[PDB]
Design a protein around this ligand. Structure first.
Ligand SMILES: *[C@@H]1O[C@H](CO)[C@@H](O)[C@H](O)[C@H]1NC(C)=O
Lengths: 391, 117, 655
């Protein structure tokens, strides 16, 4: 008798989703284990509403574990979930971008096992995609938004290790506290083509707005953004130049039910491996922890048995920090109609792209000279021109 | 990618027509669009072209009879042809090249234009 | 208007202090322009209920600020993490009356938090300045792996990089363990005696017991800790004279809340300006909207001012540190603490009795003792060093070469006498020659004795990153010196930019270049016969050498680099025999070695003249205590001129 619940906030896709996911584990099972399910949903959510629900549900049906889903991309709700799971020593696995927004992780006492790409894993693809068309990573502009220290350090090490190319020149940061043209002063001091930035969504609107005034939104420039920038939405804000490169997890063609079914299997199979190995009973807490938490502390957790899960044709093994080593990264662009369109896929450490050479289409209108980017034809001949195979 | 040509028919000499070729794609800014003609007994021949920059080249053979135009907003290139002569009887084709891709020569089903008395 | 401020305490008795605080805030200014009100919450026998009650207190009024206090239980982060994250969910700033954990100082983990007490980290710079005043150059650091360990490592690294002294011996011991003796024994031979500790009380006690066991707690050793290691069971048993420090105002409680109320009132009074004040978030229902004017409040409060009070005027750091306050120097005088001086961060003013050290001698603890023996590593190069098999009696044959006076010889060990195939073999032999005589002269000059070893494999040294790391480990003697296996290199080692980046060199003593060896179209490096590949002449060098990196640092010679990388040998005399055997056409190497080999041997010709000049120099680890005497000795040798006499002995007259 395993327990599970799903939550949906400000969504209109839950009612049928719960029933379809309900019949899933019955056949997906390959072990004569047991499964019980329940579903719920709520409107615009707050920490107080979140915390009240979890023990109300836990005290009701003696919850073995829960799966979480929310949206709107709030940094706060990320730090809200984890510390709840920390004290109650219950395995909680939340699966969606709002929950999957990256965090610096907490003490090993917690059992959260986040479901998304790491900062290092995300960045290394961003640096690698440069090796395709645009040569040198030119500029890095960042605010004081958390997580910058790990980012600028990782890229600096990997650029000074490989000898090939990669002549990074200028890296700058801006103080939002001085919200005036003083930022434009520091911003005006970089001249190059490809600009890489790492900031929050709200500041992204302002900084790109300032650049359009000076002219960095021109036809000759390329902007590269990580996943967290506007990834978890379908309604793009204004001031974003038409034409943008991001590597995100949004998984255009995937379904939450598909993700939930995989998540459910991670719960049951891993616990099945530990329980059957040593006749282990997953002793539940008598309530949410006021006093009765201590006797269950000596009981061994599922961490030795939850790191490795199989089936569904994907090595879903986690790590110490809770980021997968076989994620489903995709790269996506802003088309002419302000509607995001998939471009290429990342799988088994390769850059498969539907585009061979860059499309080079314009920014937001009323600014389009477009008189550059010449094409050249050449013949292989005597030492004027020589051809060779790629090393 | 796939295109589609249309606009043909029968028109008396000295008349006019409006041929059109269209294709679906999100990058439609950057494609060379060319018109090809191939009559019975003759090799395929170029007629009119449009560049990515926005320049127009017209073949000297039948220069001045027709004109080319491209709409950046809507993915369709249509060819406005005027002062028809019997020498123009053929099946006109539309094509694109470059901005990615491979196996680069793209040909529609074909539209036959007939000029006669 | 009415301004509301919240506070969280654990007393139910200094709630009277909270009431007095709100009364004083009214007393400072009550002109009806700004009015203050306060709320309070109890302590934590749980977390969920108190978090809910804090939310209720927030929705109770138009809250603007929060204050928190210390817990009685040893729960490291019991009270902070409920309120901290909940408040950061709305970017509402909060002040920490008392806490020292370095997790909250990282603005990358949590929201904006301002501390009126410095963390453990910045005090490290304080005793760093203390040591700089008392002239300690070689130091030993011992830290744990917890968040405190990482933070201390980062802060100390920044402080060192401020001076770029490159502190050595960064060793870390596993936390929460017992019977761990390896680390202290490993660090015992670093030739310096000062160690720095930072850990919990139990770990400090275990380290104290281990050090008492290993006898490193006697005289000649001096070592100081922070404040967390001189309390509780840690203070139970400890060596006498442990230098330490105490916070400026430790557990003054209701005083610091008064100072915080004063400074926050000043900040709010200074805030009554800007275009869109709007209002502070209110209510826990349907109030997920972001707190737009949040960052401006933190920015203005950080740069505030407050000068009248016990706490003192403060200019908060970029992350909310106490900036520059004061500190007290303590010492252990027979199980009794005593103040010895006061350090206001910028300097130390000794204003008490003399501070006696554990040995009992008042003498300055500036040992840094120079050991008599030093490690020597070399490579087998013909003209400078010759390997000689010793006789059965244990001493290789004496040889009066030219004047009857014996030539000096030394006992040199290390190699297997067979580089290509040897499972394991170390044998003693005799080494003699140019560099050996030079080293003998140096030793007779600078009054120290020596010990000689040989390299593991035989490659000179070249940066190379292949696998098992994210860096290029220096294969060969160059990395043998870096990793600590060696202490000094006396060998024909030329100087280049890459090696000059890490190690420090002395003045050169013999110039040379690169030259071509040919056996009796060959000319300087201008011909197409060498510019373009051709089977008539095959060129090669010795792998992992200076020539390789020289030819790999030029885009214009990629074809030559690839041709060289197609095949090359790893040998010195074997290639000479091969070219003498008509197997190889020609190859390039150093000047002096090739020139001596050509004239000393039979039927050899020097091809052309040098193209790239360079010198030979003794290499030592960066920041060594030997740079000074070495240069003056070398120049004294140049002036006297018997280095030229040695040159006459070894490379002048072949008879
Ligand atoms: C150089 O030699 C002098 C000679 O007395 C002595 O101080 C020491 O060995 C060396 N000094 C320095 C500063 O290296």
């Amino acid at each position: 008798a395993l327990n599970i619940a799903v939550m949906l906030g400000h969504s209109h896709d839950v009612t049928e989703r719960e029933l379809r996911t309900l019949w899933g584990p019955e056949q997906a099972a390959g072990l004569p284990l047991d499964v019980n399910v329940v579903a719920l949903l709520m409107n615009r959510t707050d920490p107080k509403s979140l915390i009240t629900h979890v023990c109300d549900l836990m005290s009701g049906a003696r919850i073995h574990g829960l799966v979480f889903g929310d949206d709107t991309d709030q940094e706060a709700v990320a730090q809200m979930l984890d510390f709840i799971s920390s004290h109650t020593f219950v395995p909680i696995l939340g699966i969606h971008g709002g929950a999957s927004m990256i965090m610096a992780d907490k003490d090993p006492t917690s059992t959260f096992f986040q479901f998304g790409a790491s900062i290092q894993q995300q960045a290394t693809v961003m640096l690698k995609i440069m090796q395709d068309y645009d040569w040198h990573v030119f500029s890095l502009v960042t605010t004081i938004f958390p997580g910058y220290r790990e980012f600028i350090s990782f890229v600096k090490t990997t650029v000074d290790n490989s000898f090939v190319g990669w002549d990074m020149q200028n890296v700058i940061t801006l103080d939002t506290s001085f919200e005036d043209a003083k930022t434009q002063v520091q911003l005006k001091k970089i001249h190059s083509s490809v600009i890489l930035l790492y900031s929050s969504k709200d500041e992204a609107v302002l900084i790109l707005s300032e650049a359009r005034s000076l002219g960095l939104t021109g036809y000759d420039f390329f902007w590269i953004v990580p996943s967290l920038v506007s990834g978890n939405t379908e309604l793009i804000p204004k001031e974003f130049p038409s034409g943008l490169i991001s590597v995100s997890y949004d998984d255009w063609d995937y379904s939450l039910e598909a993700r939930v079914r995989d998540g459910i299997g991670i719960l049951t199979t891993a616990a099945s491996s530990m329980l059957e190995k040593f006749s282990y009973i997953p002793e539940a807490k008598a309530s949410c922890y006021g006093q009765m938490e201590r006797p269950e502390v000596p009981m061994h957790t599922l961490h030795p048995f939850m790191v490795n899960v199989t089936w569904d044709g994907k090595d879903l093994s986690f790590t110490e920090e809770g980021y997968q080593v076989h994620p489903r990264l995709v790269v996506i662009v802003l088309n002419k109609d302000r509607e995001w369109e998939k471009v290429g896929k990342w799988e088994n450490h390769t850059l498969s792209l539907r585009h061979a050479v860059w499309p080079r289409y314009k920014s937001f209108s009323d600014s389009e000279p477009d008189d550059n980017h010449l094409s050249i034809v050449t013949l292989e001949e005597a030492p004027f021109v020589i051809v060779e195979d790629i090393d | 990618v796939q295109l589609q040509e249309s606009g043909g028919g029968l028109v008396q000499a000295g008349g006019s027509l409006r041929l059109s070729c269209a294709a679906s794609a999100a990058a439609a800014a950057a494609a060379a669009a060319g018109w090809y003609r191939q009559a019975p007994g003759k090799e395929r021949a170029a007629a009119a072209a449009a560049a990515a920059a926005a320049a127009a080249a017209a073949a000297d053979s039948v220069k001045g009879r027709f004109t080319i135009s491209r709409d950046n907003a809507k993915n369709t290139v249509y060819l406005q042809m005027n002062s028809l002569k019997p020498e123009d009887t053929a099946v006109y084709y539309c094509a694109a090249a470059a901005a990615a891709a491979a196996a680069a020569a793209y040909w529609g089903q074909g539209t036959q234009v007939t000029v006669s008395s | 208007k009415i301004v509301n401020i919240g506070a969280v305490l654990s007393t139910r008795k200094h709630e009277q202090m909270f009431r007095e605080a709100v009364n004083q805030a009214n007393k400072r200014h009550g002109s009806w322009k700004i009015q203050l009100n306060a709320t309070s919450v109890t302590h934590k026998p749980n977390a969920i209920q108190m978090a809910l009650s804090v939310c209720e207190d927030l929705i109770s009024s138009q809250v603007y600020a929060i204050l928190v206090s210390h817990p009685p239980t040893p729960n490291d982060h019991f009270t902070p993490t409920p309120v901290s994250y909940t408040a950061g969910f709305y970017r509402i700033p909060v002040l920490g009356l008392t806490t020292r954990m370095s997790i909250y100082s990282d603005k990358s983990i949590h929201l904006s938090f301002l501390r009126t007490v410095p963390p453990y980290s910045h005090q490290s710079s304080v005793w760093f300045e203390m040591m700089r005043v008392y002239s300690w150059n070689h130091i030993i650091l011992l830290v744990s792996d917890d968040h405190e360990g990482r933070a201390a490592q980062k802060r100390l690294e920044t402080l060192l990089e401020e001076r770029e002294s490159k502190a050595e011996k960064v060793l870390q011991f596993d936390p929460g363990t017992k019977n761990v003796t390896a680390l202290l024994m490993e660090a015992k031979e670093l030739e310096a005696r000062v160690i720095i500790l930072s850990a919990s009380e139990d770990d400090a006690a275990t380290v104290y017991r281990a050090a008492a066991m290993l006898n490193m707690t006697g005289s000649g050793y001096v070592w100081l800790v922070g404040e967390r290691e001189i309390s509780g069971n840690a203070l139970r048993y400890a060596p006498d004279g442990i230098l330490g420090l105490q916070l400026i105002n430790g557990k003054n409680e209701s005083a610091h809340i008064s100072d915080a109320v004063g400074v926050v009132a000043q900040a709010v009074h200074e805030l009554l300006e800007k275009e869109n004040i709007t209002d502070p978030p209110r209510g826990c229902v349907g109030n997920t909207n972001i707190w737009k004017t949040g960052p401006l409040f933190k920015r203005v409060l950080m740069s505030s001012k407050y000068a009248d009070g016990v706490t003192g005027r403060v200019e908060f750091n970029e992350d909310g540190d106490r900036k520059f306050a004061n500190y007290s120097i303590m010492n252990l005088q027979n199980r009794k603490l005593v103040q010895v001086g006061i350090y206001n961060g910028t300097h130390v003013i000794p204003n008490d009795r003399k501070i006696i050290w554990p040995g009992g001698e008042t003498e300055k603890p500036r040992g840094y003792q120079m050991s008599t023996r030093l490690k020597i590593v070399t490579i087998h190069q013909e003209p400078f060093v010759y390997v000689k098999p010793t006789l059965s009696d244990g001493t290789c044959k004496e040889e009066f070469t030219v004047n009857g006076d014996p030539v000096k010889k030394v006992i040199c060990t290390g190699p297997n006498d067979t580089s290509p195939g040897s499972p394991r073999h170390t044998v003693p032999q005799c080494c003699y020659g140019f560099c050996i005589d030079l080293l003998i002269k140096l030793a007779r000059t600078m009054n120290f004795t020596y010990e000689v070893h040989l390299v593991a494999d035989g490659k000179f040294g070249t940066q190379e990153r292949v696998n098992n790391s994210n860096k290029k480990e220096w294969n060969g003697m160059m990395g043998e010196l870096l990793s600590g296996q060696a202490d000094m290199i006396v060998a024909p080692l030329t100087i280049n930019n890459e090696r000059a980046q890490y190690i420090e060199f002395s003045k050169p003593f013999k110039y040379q270049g690169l030259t071509i060896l040919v056996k009796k179209r060959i000319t300087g490096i201008n011909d197409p016969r060498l510019r373009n590949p051709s089977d008539k002449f095959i060129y090669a060098t010795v792998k992992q050498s200076s020539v390789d990196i020289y030819f790999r640092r030029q885009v214009e010679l990629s074809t030559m680099y690839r041709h060289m990388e197609k095949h090359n040998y790893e040998s010195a005399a074997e290639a000479i025999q091969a070219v003498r055997d008509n197997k190889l056409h020609a190859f390039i190497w150093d000047s002096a070695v090739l020139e001596f080999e050509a004239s000393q041997k039979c039927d050899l010709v020097t091809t052309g003249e040098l193209f790239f000049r360079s010198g030979f120099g003794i290499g030592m680890r960066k920041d060594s205590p030997w740079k000074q005497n070495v240069s003056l000795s070398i120049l004294k040798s140049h002036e006297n001129g018997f280095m030229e006499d040695l040159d006459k002995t070894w490379v002048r007259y072949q008879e």
